[PDB]
Structure 1
Amino acid sequence: ADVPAGVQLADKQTLVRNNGSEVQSLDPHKIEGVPESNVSRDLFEGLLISDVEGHPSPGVAEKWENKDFKVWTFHLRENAKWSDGTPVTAHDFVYSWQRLADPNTASPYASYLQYGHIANIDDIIAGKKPATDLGVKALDDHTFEVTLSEPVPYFYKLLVHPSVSPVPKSAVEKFGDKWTQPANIVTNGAYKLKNWVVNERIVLERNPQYWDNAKTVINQVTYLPISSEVTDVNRYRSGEIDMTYNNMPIELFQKLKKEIPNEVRVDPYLCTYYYEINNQKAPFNDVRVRTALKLALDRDIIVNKVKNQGDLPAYSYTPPYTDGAKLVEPEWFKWSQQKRNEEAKKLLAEAGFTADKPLTFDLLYNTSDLHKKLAIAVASIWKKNLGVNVNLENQEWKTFLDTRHQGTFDVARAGWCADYNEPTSFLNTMLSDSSNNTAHYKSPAFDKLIADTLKVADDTQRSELYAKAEQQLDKDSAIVPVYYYVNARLVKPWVGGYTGKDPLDNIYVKNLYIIKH
């Protein structure tokens, strides 16, 4: 943390953050969500990290160079250490990225190494070459060298993500699945795990071996797993929570902006809220059904009337303000809602649905007051605009993500937040073989458009290709875009260091500080 001259620090430097739900895991290779990544940034540090404004900056790597955007060499700081005092080396990264690539690990982020195009990843994922063939090597204890199969100019931007953080081989090997328990875990970020009580709290304590420990200010941070946004706000306003999670309650938000304006932080965020359609399951493998659902949803009602928190109606998967995004708005988005509804009803009548044999299916969402309120509105809108019946179903976060990976679903509430600010952080997730492809969407045409983006060495051609990839997605109605998020949360006046300037919201508690109050 960089505490401003003249600010007074509180005697006690402790922080309580709500984190939305119980994490899937603390293992960097078994996670894919925001709540998971919130805790991972405090415990595990990769080659680069985001600075307080979100720019990719030195992490374990203090400096790096690239040869033709294909061979990247990272010079690791001599004093990077794990929490047991042993050195963080380039061999740690070698073992780590191989473990990420290995199909036996089953990471939901195995494909992150495809997105960066590390050499031999496709074969490794396919079981054809062992994970040891991956294009990574330690040229020495403090030098990590990555070889890609094509030039990727934005490659380093990917490296702040938890899936490319190191994991400690000895704890992993020795304790297997229990390596992340507090008595076993070893970490290299600014914090260490102190306590982990499932469905109660996660408590982290400063890691004194962290290389930048002298600038760390908060000695302890607790992450809570509260999925009720109302409860989160209540415990924030009672004094227990210093920073809510960034899901705000429909019940209280308008009142909060009028009551504690200075505390309600609202900033740009690179995430899209949509309904994920299970593209491989009838009748959702029919484009007319997906197009109907997409068109009959009234974004104006949902965004402006039912939510009303500053979100923007969405017509694409990649947020239009992502760096490099130059998207074309489909004509349906400028049509009337009435005109959307007729087209929709027309398509469903064409797909064979009547009044007598209507379309009925499940709407799966992760336990939350906000998602429940939004699914109820969407269910009534779909019912009135299109005659479809939906059965709402909630599942705890971890179970919800697993259900979507398994494909044991019809439609699900969904939200993707960028991992790096470039259109492929979204688009690569709809690739046929992506491990992040929970829409279970498979389009040869869509895959070819994205593969083409690294064949050209031009950014204009590249943006035009991302634009057409978004048009292929929309044409197929792979999803139902609903709105582009804003990052809205409550933060106490004594919490310093949070700018709200990072559109990825990659917060590190090592950057925060408690002002005396």
Structure 2
Amino acid sequence: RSELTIVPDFYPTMVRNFNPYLATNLRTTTDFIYEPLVVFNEMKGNTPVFRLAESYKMADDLMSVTFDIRKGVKWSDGEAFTADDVVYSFGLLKAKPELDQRGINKWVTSVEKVDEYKVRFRLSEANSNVPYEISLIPIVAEHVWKDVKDPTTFTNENPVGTGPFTVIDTFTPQLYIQCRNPNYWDAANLEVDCLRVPQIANNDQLLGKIVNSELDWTSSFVPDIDRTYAAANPNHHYWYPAAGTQAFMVNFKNPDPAKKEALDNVDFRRAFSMALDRQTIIDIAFYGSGTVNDFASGLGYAFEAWSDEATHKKYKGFNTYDVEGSKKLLAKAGFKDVNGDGFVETPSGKSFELLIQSPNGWTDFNNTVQLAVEQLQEVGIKAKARTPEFAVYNQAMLEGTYDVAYTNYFHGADPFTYWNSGYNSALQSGDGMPRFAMHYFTDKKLDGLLDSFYKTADKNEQLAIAHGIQKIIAENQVTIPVMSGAWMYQYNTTRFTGWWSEENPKGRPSVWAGIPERLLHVLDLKPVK
């Protein structure tokens, strides 16, 4: 039996939860258990790869879109996959908005069933990118979930899915094995029988295992990769294609008076920013992987084609290592040390220590925070590294109780994914939404520009919109962008072949939940002969 050992996420222990709509589920639920209608290859310019849906047609006015369901597709329990499943799934999100992870309810007014295998989504507002948005909403089995009294707490321990791996062959606190859907519609193209998911708590435990070659597919941070991982075995391979932005997010509505006086001050944010030595952070915390990001808007040099150089040039200085500039700005801004501790107090003389957040186990981020704390001390800003578990880290943000958090973002073929997910105030409310836009800075014009991006197909018009987004975010130094990272990815050729690589760059190679292309990738693998 071919078993592919994968690590899409860390856990202290394995807790059986296959609910695609809950943040507490196993990260092998979406894609593998519940296959999407379509999987957009974001690397290749967001090209749709059709799976459960055969095709789709967006109306010319961009106010609706139809999807043709592929006939002959079955749930793991033999029942047919039809339009009823899609209709029910979005209806569920309307019934329980906490399960709405994309904020899709705002855009989709209704989801009508044209026929057994055809559904039509009607929008509340024009969005040519709605097909992409729809593709990220998990679709569950209506014949099963209609009998579930409370979907919000349903752990779905014995899942019925459309995906390649639905059989829970083994489940212990330290390991679970997800095997082949006995009724998979694309069975002929699946050459991997089981997904082997061992319990790994953090980057330290992962390193020990990966160098010992007991893993096949991973996307973790690995220190000194060449010496410690690559040079240790000819089957140890990796590929780090460029990815999105990484930055420190500040909470504009921190409940502490002193902290809010600091964080909700653009001069302080710029001074915080100039204190950071971005290159040293990349060299030290990331071992030279990644590039400096001195775009106040967080755009990143990779997307320079979308940048208005003038805007970049004007705020670049506030996003460049400059100790003297940082201290001079703090002083000019009225931030001074009035109690002899070497740290600046707020203008009203209040003391504060910024608790910088980064998830426990994410050593590359943890090291970045500590480096940042030390760099901030140089400019007189008092801070301390905190490493709460991801759940806590994430919660403190949805609830706005954190101070500062270092984080990465998802990355698309253009800056929209980044700007929209990291700044649209619509994504700042609602349980079930990610952390990305939880800085609590809001602007009507910004939201308008963002929401207008896909209302037009005129690239020159979209560029004009992009420029408008750039200058609002840059002007307000909403976050403290630091760098553009990469899709960390490691593969072992000991047991399987067919992996994506620089030489076979089919798309984002990551195995993390949220990278739907992982379904396509796994379907390219085959055990060694």
How high is the TM-score relative to the length of structure 2?
0.81
Q: 3-state DSSP class of the match of 1:289?
A: helix
5+ residue gaps, structure 1: 1-11, 119-133
* Residue identity matched to 1:361: L
Structure 1 residues 306 and 399: alpha-carbon distance in aligned structure 2, compared to 1, 3 A threshold: closer
Q: 3-state DSSP class of the match of 2:402?
A: coil
Structure 1 residues 472 and 264: alpha-carbon distance in aligned structure 2, compared to 1, 3 A threshold: farther
Aligned to 1:402: 395
Does 2:371 align with 1:371? no
Deviation at 1:514, TM superposition (A): 4.0
Deviation at 1:224, TM superposition (A): 3.7
Aligned residues of 2:192 and 2:527 also touching (Cα < 8 A): no
Aligned residues of 1:182 and 1:196 also touching (Cα < 8 A): no
Aligned to 1:17: 6
2:130 to 155, 178, 183: 155
Aligned to 1:124: none
* Residue identity matched to 1:140: D
Aligned residues of 1:363 and 1:391 also touching (Cα < 8 A): yes
Aligned to 2:35: 45
Deviation at 1:57, TM superposition (A): 0.9
Aligned to 1:165: 139
Aligned to 1:513: 525
Does 2:500 align with 1:499? yes
Does 2:404 align with 1:411? yes
Tell me the C-alpha RMSD between the 2 structures.
3.1
Superposed counterparts of 1:58-457, under 5 Å: 58-68=50-60, 69-102=62-95, 104-107=96-99, 109-114=101-106, 117-118=107-108, 134-161=109-136, 163-166=137-140, 168=142, 170-171=144-145, 173-174=147-148, 176=150, 177=152, 179-183=154-158, 185-194=159-168, 200-244=174-218, 246-250=219-223, 255-260=228-233, 263-281=236-254, 282=260, 283-314=262-293, 315=295, 316-321=297-302, 325-326=306-307, 328=309, 330-331=312-313, 335=317, 340-355=322-337, 356=339, 358=344, 359-368=352-361, 369-384=363-378, 386-418=379-411, 421-429=413-421, 430-435=423-428, 436=434, 437-457=437-457
Structure 1 residues 396 and 199: alpha-carbon distance in aligned structure 2, compared to 1, 3 A threshold: farther
Structure 1 residues 453 and 410: alpha-carbon distance in aligned structure 2, compared to 1, 3 A threshold: same
Deviation at 1:97, TM superposition (A): 1.6
Structure 1 residues 254 and 319: alpha-carbon distance in aligned structure 2, compared to 1, 3 A threshold: farther
Structure 1 residues 320 and 109: alpha-carbon distance in aligned structure 2, compared to 1, 3 A threshold: farther
* Residue identity matched to 1:425: T
Structure 1 residues 460 and 213: alpha-carbon distance in aligned structure 2, compared to 1, 3 A threshold: same
Which stretch of structure 1 is more off in the superposition, 332-341 or 472-481?
Answer: 332-341
Structure 1 residues 150 and 321: alpha-carbon distance in aligned structure 2, compared to 1, 3 A threshold: farther
Structure 1 residues 422 and 264: alpha-carbon distance in aligned structure 2, compared to 1, 3 A threshold: same
Deviation at 1:452, TM superposition (A): 3.5
Deviation at 1:379, TM superposition (A): 1.2
Q: 3-state DSSP class of the match of 1:483?
A: strand
Aligned residues of 1:407 and 1:438 also touching (Cα < 8 A): yes
Q: 3-state DSSP class of the match of 2:182?
A: coil
The whole-number CA distance in structure 2 between the counterparts of 1:259 and 1:375 is: 30
The whole-number CA distance in structure 2 between the counterparts of 1:288 and 1:323 is: 25
Deviation at 1:336, TM superposition (A): 9.6
Aligned residues of 1:242 and 1:491 also touching (Cα < 8 A): yes
Deviation at 1:100, TM superposition (A): 2.4
Aligned residues of 2:211 and 2:232 also touching (Cα < 8 A): no
Structure 1 residues 338 and 190: alpha-carbon distance in aligned structure 2, compared to 1, 3 A threshold: closer
Aligned residues of 2:71 and 2:117 also touching (Cα < 8 A): yes
Aligned to 1:123: none
Q: Give the aligned length.
A: 481
The whole-number CA distance in structure 2 between the counterparts of 1:45 and 1:345 is: 53
5+ residue gaps, structure 2: 255-259, 345-351, 429-433, 511-516
Structure 1 residues 412 and 181: alpha-carbon distance in aligned structure 2, compared to 1, 3 A threshold: same
Aligned residues of 2:75 and 2:81 also touching (Cα < 8 A): yes
Q: 3-state DSSP class of the match of 1:100?
A: helix
Percent of aligned positions that are identical: 17
Deviation at 1:166, TM superposition (A): 3.5
